[PDB]
Write an enzyme that holds these catalytic residues in place. Structure first.
Site, PDB file in Angstrom:
ATOM      1  N   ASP A   1      -8.742   4.149  12.120  1.00  0.00           N
ATOM      2  CA  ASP A   1      -8.831   4.634  10.750  1.00  0.00           C
ATOM      3  C   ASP A   1      -8.359   6.088  10.602  1.00  0.00           C
ATOM      4  O   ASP A   1      -8.143   6.560   9.474  1.00  0.00           O
ATOM      5  CB  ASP A   1     -10.273   4.528  10.240  1.00  0.00           C
ATOM      6  CG  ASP A   1     -10.778   3.105  10.184  1.00  0.00           C
ATOM      7  OD1 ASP A   1     -10.036   2.213   9.737  1.00  0.00           O
ATOM      8  OD2 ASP A   1     -11.953   2.891  10.558  1.00  0.00           O
TER       9      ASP A   1
ATOM     10  N   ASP B   1      -7.580   1.364  -2.220  1.00  0.00           N
ATOM     11  CA  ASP B   1      -7.912   2.758  -2.519  1.00  0.00           C
ATOM     12  C   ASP B   1      -7.203   3.245  -3.779  1.00  0.00           C
ATOM     13  O   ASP B   1      -6.813   4.399  -3.852  1.00  0.00           O
ATOM     14  CB  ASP B   1      -7.607   3.699  -1.335  1.00  0.00           C
ATOM     15  CG  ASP B   1      -8.220   5.066  -1.522  1.00  0.00           C
ATOM     16  OD1 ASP B   1      -9.241   5.174  -2.235  1.00  0.00           O
ATOM     17  OD2 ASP B   1      -7.661   6.043  -0.986  1.00  0.00           O
TER      18      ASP B   1
ATOM     19  N   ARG C   1      -0.752   8.437  -3.810  1.00  0.00           N
ATOM     20  CA  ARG C   1      -1.678   7.512  -3.157  1.00  0.00           C
ATOM     21  C   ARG C   1      -2.967   8.227  -2.757  1.00  0.00           C
ATOM     22  O   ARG C   1      -2.967   9.422  -2.437  1.00  0.00           O
ATOM     23  CB  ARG C   1      -1.016   6.891  -1.922  1.00  0.00           C
ATOM     24  CG  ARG C   1      -1.460   5.458  -1.649  1.00  0.00           C
ATOM     25  CD  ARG C   1      -0.781   4.886  -0.427  1.00  0.00           C
ATOM     26  NE  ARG C   1      -1.276   5.511   0.811  1.00  0.00           N
ATOM     27  CZ  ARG C   1      -0.753   5.319   2.015  1.00  0.00           C
ATOM     28  NH1 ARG C   1       0.294   4.513   2.194  1.00  0.00           N
ATOM     29  NH2 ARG C   1      -1.277   5.936   3.077  1.00  0.00           N
ATOM     30  N   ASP C   2      -4.063   7.486  -2.781  1.00  0.00           N
ATOM     31  CA  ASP C   2      -5.356   7.991  -2.295  1.00  0.00           C
ATOM     32  C   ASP C   2      -5.759   9.290  -3.015  1.00  0.00           C
ATOM     33  O   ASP C   2      -6.105  10.288  -2.361  1.00  0.00           O
ATOM     34  CB  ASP C   2      -5.341   8.154  -0.772  1.00  0.00           C
ATOM     35  CG  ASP C   2      -4.691   6.987  -0.085  1.00  0.00           C
ATOM     36  OD1 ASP C   2      -5.247   5.866  -0.153  1.00  0.00           O
ATOM     37  OD2 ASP C   2      -3.621   7.175   0.507  1.00  0.00           O
TER      38      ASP C   2
ATOM     39  N   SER D   1      -3.310  12.573   2.003  1.00  0.00           N
ATOM     40  CA  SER D   1      -2.777  11.212   2.042  1.00  0.00           C
ATOM     41  C   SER D   1      -1.455  11.193   2.767  1.00  0.00           C
ATOM     42  O   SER D   1      -0.640  12.123   2.613  1.00  0.00           O
ATOM     43  CB  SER D   1      -2.578  10.646   0.634  1.00  0.00           C
ATOM     44  OG  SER D   1      -1.926   9.379   0.690  1.00  0.00           O
TER      45      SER D   1
ATOM     46  N   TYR E   1       0.831  -1.198   0.000  1.00  0.00           N
ATOM     47  CA  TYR E   1       0.000   0.000   0.000  1.00  0.00           C
ATOM     48  C   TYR E   1       0.877   1.264   0.000  1.00  0.00           C
ATOM     49  O   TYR E   1       1.055   1.907   1.024  1.00  0.00           O
ATOM     50  CB  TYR E   1      -0.976  -0.060   1.194  1.00  0.00           C
ATOM     51  CG  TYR E   1      -1.921   1.121   1.347  1.00  0.00           C
ATOM     52  CD1 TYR E   1      -2.603   1.656   0.260  1.00  0.00           C
ATOM     53  CD2 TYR E   1      -2.124   1.697   2.592  1.00  0.00           C
ATOM     54  CE1 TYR E   1      -3.472   2.716   0.411  1.00  0.00           C
ATOM     55  CE2 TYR E   1      -2.990   2.766   2.760  1.00  0.00           C
ATOM     56  CZ  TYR E   1      -3.652   3.271   1.665  1.00  0.00           C
ATOM     57  OH  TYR E   1      -4.503   4.338   1.829  1.00  0.00           O
TER      58      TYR E   1
HETATM   59 MG   LIG Z   1       3.630  12.833   3.528  1.00  0.00          MG
END
Ligand SMILES: [Mg+2]
Ligand SMILES: O=[N+]([O-])c1ccc(O[C@@H]2O[C@H](CO)[C@@H](O[C@@H]3O[C@H](CO)[C@@H](O[C@@H]4O[C@H](CO)[C@@H](O)[C@H](O)[C@H]4O)[C@H](O)[C@H]3O)[C@H](O)[C@H]2O)cc1
Ligand SMILES: O=[N+]([O-])c1ccc(O[C@@H]2O[C@H](CO)[C@@H](O[C@@H]3O[C@H](CO)[C@@H](O[C@@H]4O[C@H](CO)[C@@H](O)[C@H](O)[C@H]4O)[C@H](O)[C@H]3O)[C@H](O)[C@H]2O)cc1
Length: 372
Positions: free
Chosen positions: A322, A138, A89-90, A96, A84
């Site tokens: 989360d 994601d 990302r995201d 993120s 991941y």
């Molecule tokens: Mg960072």
């Protein structure tokens, strides 16, 4: 072949140790049954997440422990990992924590991060084990529904090329790969099914341009989410979605995978799926209050009830937050103060003991106690 059959997915020692705090809480309450249920949870396998480069340092000790356990127990140890760390990302999120960014050599850095994982999964000890690896939660769903987002527009090719490299880099007889495929409330909507199947196939085809006969086992669904496997009481927010539980998501997505020639085998996260009716909107995701541990990891077809499902698994480890609910935190996410969220909550990944207490109490089926 279904790599889960006959295999014993690895209990993650560092996760089991965190649950000692939950056992202590219950013992202090004079609640021996829930203390014993928590001990059961200590023996339930979960996925180890590799969500940054530093965490690569944990892999060889995990493998060494896994080999010792295999020797001691005579089991066929199945190490479960999540990769991941895509660059940008995201992409649809406001923020993120992903450490790689396309404008700072992120694509090349992601390749080297994969290469570092490959090195750890290529030792003599690693060769003794089997691996099940979930690729990039994601990620590709964003190319289906979030292409109006500038960051997703700019990351689409990189997500496909990144995952393609990860697939092409991990072709070994002792490794099975599952590409993350979101959850029924994201990609299960009628108009999302075909483009999803197409992007999974497109990504696999790119992998095959790197490593000729590259394959994956299939898809991972409901990772970090709460959707039931089979709903007892269908939720109003699932109206007009045929993937109103994860078993129905499998059944609804499978024909599209078959049509494009992508393998239609699934693993399904149910680690926080025991209790329904905990959200008012399907898109609520952050520390949903009163969540329960769901169906325990299993390949039993009397439960799974689908040739297309390899196993129910626990991917997101329950109790790892989360995200924080503190409005002043640097990484504060407003979703973590949703009307359905458990507040106060600590930083993403940090131990949330009160939440685990509730995961035990709200487990369905009830947890069988483990007594010494
Ligand atoms: Mg960072
Ligand atoms: O009335 N309708 O007919 C209709 C049709 C389509 C609609 O759109 C869907 O709505 C879903 C909401 O569940 C979205 O899914 C969320 O996506 C988030 C990341 O974007 C994830 O974080 C959440 O997890 C995930 O739940 C989907 O993208 C989106 O395609 C909505 C209504
Ligand atoms: O499907 N999704 O959309 C989605 C989205 C976000 C997700 O979040 C990730 O969840 C992982 C699992 O909790 C976290 O990993 C934990 O991090 C701790 C850091 O202290 C370690 O201690 C634990 O060990 C280690 O397991 C990651 O931080 C966190 O970023 C996951 C899925």
């Amino acid at each position: 072949v279904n790599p889960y059959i006959g295999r014993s997915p690895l209990v993650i020692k560092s996760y089991a140790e965190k649950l000692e705090e939950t056992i202590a809480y219950f013992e202090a309450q004079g609640d021996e049954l829930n203390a014993a249920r928590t001990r059961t949870v200590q023996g339930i396998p979960t996925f180890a997440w590799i969500s940054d480069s530093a965490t690569i340092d944990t892999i060889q000790p995990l493998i060494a422990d896994a080999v010792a356990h295999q020797e001691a127990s005579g089991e066929q140890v199945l190490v479960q990992l999540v990769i991941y760390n895509l660059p940008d990302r995201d992409c649809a999120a406001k923020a993120s924590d992903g450490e790689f960014h396309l404008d700072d050599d992120g694509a090349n850095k992601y390749r080297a991060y994969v290469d570092r994982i490959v090195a750890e999964l290529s030792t003599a000890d690693a060769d003794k084990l089997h691996f099940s690896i979930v690729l990039e939660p994601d990620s590709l769903g964003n190319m289906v529904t979030n292409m109006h987002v500038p960051k997703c527009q700019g990351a689409a090719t990189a997500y496909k090329e990144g995952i393609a490299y990860t697939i092409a880099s991990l072709q070994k007889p002792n490794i099975d790969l599952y590409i993350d495929a979101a959850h029924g409330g994201w990609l299960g909507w009628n108009d999302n099914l075909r483009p999803s199947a197409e992007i999974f196939k497109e990504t696999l085809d790119l992998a095959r341009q790197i490593t000729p006969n590259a394959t994956v086992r299939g898809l991972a669904i409901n990772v970090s989410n709460y959707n039931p496997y089979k709903t007892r009481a269908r939720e109003d927010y699932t109206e007009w979605n045929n993937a109103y539980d994860e078993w129905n998501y499998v059944k609804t997505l499978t024909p599209h995978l078959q049509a494009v020639g992508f393998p239609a085998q699934f693993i399904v996260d149910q680690g926080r799926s025991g209790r329904e009716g905990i959200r008012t909107e399907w898109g609520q995701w952050c520390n949903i209050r009163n969540a329960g541990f769901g169906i325990r990891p299993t390949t039993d077809q009397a439960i799974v009830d689908s040739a297309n499902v390899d196993a129910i698994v626990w991917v997101k480890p329950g109790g790892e937050s989360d995200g924080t609910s503190d409005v002043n935190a640097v990484r504060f996410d407003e979703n973590c103060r949703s009307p359905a969220s458990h507040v106060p909550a600590p930083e993403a990944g940090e131990w949330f003991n009160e939440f685990v207490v509730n995961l035990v109490i709200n487990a369905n089926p009830p947890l069988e106690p483990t007594y010494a």
